[PDB]
Amino acid sequence: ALPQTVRIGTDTTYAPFSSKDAKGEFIGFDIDLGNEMCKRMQVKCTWVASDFDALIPSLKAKKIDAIISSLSITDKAQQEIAFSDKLYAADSRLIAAKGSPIQPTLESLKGKHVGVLQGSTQEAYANDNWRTKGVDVVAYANQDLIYSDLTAGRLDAALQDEVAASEGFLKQPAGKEYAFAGPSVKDKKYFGDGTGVGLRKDDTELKAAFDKALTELRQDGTYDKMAKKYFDFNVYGD
Numbered sequence: 001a002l003p004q005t006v007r008i009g010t011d012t013t014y015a016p017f018s019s020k021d022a023k024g025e026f027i028g029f030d031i032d033l034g035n036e037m038c039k040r041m042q043v044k045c046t047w048v049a050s051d052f053d054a055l056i057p058s059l060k061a062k063k064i065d066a067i068i069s070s071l072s073i074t075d076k077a078q079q080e081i082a083f084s085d086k087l088y089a090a091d092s093r094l095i096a097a098k099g100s101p102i103q104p105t106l107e108s109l110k111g112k113h114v115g116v117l118q119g120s121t122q123e124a125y126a127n128d129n130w131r132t133k134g135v136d137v138v139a140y141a142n143q144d145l146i147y148s149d150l151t152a153g154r155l156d157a158a159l160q161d162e163v164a165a166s167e168g169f170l171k172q173p174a175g176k177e178y179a180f181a182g183p184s185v186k187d188k189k190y191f192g193d194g195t196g197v198g199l200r201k202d203d204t205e206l207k208a209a210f211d212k213a214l215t216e217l218r219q220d221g222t223y224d225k226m227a228k229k230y231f232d233f234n235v236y237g238d
């Protein structure tokens with residue numbers, strides 16, 4: 001027994017998953033997935049923009065009903081909220097200036113300024129592994145601020161979801177001087193297993209509804225066709 005309107009929170013500074021076009025309309029793979037699921041659920045949905053670190057608290061306060069915002073399914077997150085089945089895979093990777101020697105290692109990063117999104121898995125990773133050991137880890141309200149501070153030369157590097165960095169910055173005008181610094185950083189504990197719809201633990205029926213719709217759009221090929229708009233690779237992963 002779902003609500004008539006499902007309110008979905010997202011942070012719109014994470015192309016190609018969630019961002020705003022020139023008119024301020026919400027666009028991206030997340031938006032397409034959410035709208036497609038809502039359609040199949042036969043509910044109305046309202047998109048709600050907010051800073052990433054506000055999403056889980058807004059959810060718990062019932063100011064939104066769901067989060068679709070490249071939110072990784074982690075053990076930690078599941079202490080607070082529930083998730084749909086996996087929407088797509090999301091590894092983390094560092095970016096730095098082209099021809100930077102930088103690596104995602106303590107040895108490389110000590111004394112350098114590294115940007116992370118506040119409230120993200122990447123902030124947790126960097127705070128635990130890098131900030132404690134003397135890396136200047138800087139946390140930001142949103143990812144656009146990070147990209148800006150990076151191109152302004154205030155940051156040496158930045159850690160975020162690999163596909164967001166690549167499609168949303170590196171392959172975009174602002175990022176032509178930049179590249180990945182080292183390989184993706186795999187850490188089961190911190191980065192979880194792909195992303196999913198974030199939900200209140202007790203909203204069992206909403207989760208089942210989302211899961212049902214997600215299954216169905218994967219089954220009839222809609223998932224792959226939508227994904228093809230953004231990616232020429234297997235975004236879903238395993």
Ligand SMILES: NC(=[NH2+])NCCC[C@H](N)C(=O)O
Nearest residue numbers: 011014069070071072120121
């Ligand atoms: N729309 C966004 N800004 N998403 C950031 C997601 C970062 C990371 N995957 C996390 O779950 O913490």
Ligand code: NA
Nearest residue numbers: 215218236238
């Ligand atoms: Na599947």
